[PDB]
Every structure is written in structure tokens, then in C-alpha cells.
Structure 1
Amino acid sequence: ATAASMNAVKDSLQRGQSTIDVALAAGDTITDLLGKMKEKALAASDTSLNTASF
């Protein structure tokens, strides 16, 4: 019985792996968007821009 009970342990570990995989995909999206936001802040920091570009 103790040996057969390991199936639930393996299933729970696999489910945790899937949860972390989804989290990493979302994190990659968030990092790309954060890089774009950095570039927008850098571009807007310039004082020679007109009102429309800002």
C-alpha cells in the first residue's frame, strides 16, 4: 500500500510543474512588455519632443 500510494505524489508533482510552466509563459510576456515600457520612458525623457509625440 505504501508503494502504491506514490502515484498521487507523482501526479501532484506533475500538476505543480504545469502550474509553474504557465507562470513562466506569462512572465516571458510580462518581461517583453516591461522592455517596451522602458523604451517608451526613455524616448519620452527627451525634452526636444513636441506635445503630440509625448
Structure 2
Amino acid sequence: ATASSLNSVKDSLQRGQSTIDVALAAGDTITDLLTKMKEKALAASDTSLNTASF
């Protein structure tokens, strides 16, 4: 009964792996988005820009 019962534990562990996979797949986008954020913030830090570019 215990050895048969372990199968749901296995399925839960790999369902959790799938959920963490989806989370990391979104974080790969969030990181690039923050990188473009910091790049545009560096570009907007300049006082030399005319107002339209800012």
C-alpha cells in the first residue's frame, strides 16, 4: 500500500517542476524587460537630450 501510495508523491513533485518551469519562463522575460528598463533610464538620465527625445 505504501509503494502504491508513492506514485501521487512522484506526480506532485513533477507537477511542481512544471510550475517552476513556467515561473522561470516568465522570469526570463522579466529580466530582459528590467535590463531594457535600466538601459532606457541611463539614456534618460542625460541632461543633453532635447525634451522630445526624453
TM-score between the two structures when normalised by the length of structure 1:
0.98
Query: Which structure is higher in helix share?
Result: 2
- Structure 2: tracts of 5 or more residues without a match: none
Alpha-carbon offset, residue 25 of structure 1 = 0.6
Shift in Å, 1:41: 0.2
- Percent identity among equivalent residues? 93
Moved over 4 A (4+): none
2:41 matches 1:41: yes
TM-score by length of structure 2 reads 0.98
Q: How many residues align?
A: 54
- Per-residue CA deviation, residues 10-50 of structure 1 (Å, 9 max, x unaligned), is 00001000000000010010000000000000000000000
Query: Superposition RMSD on alpha carbons, in Å?
Result: 0.4
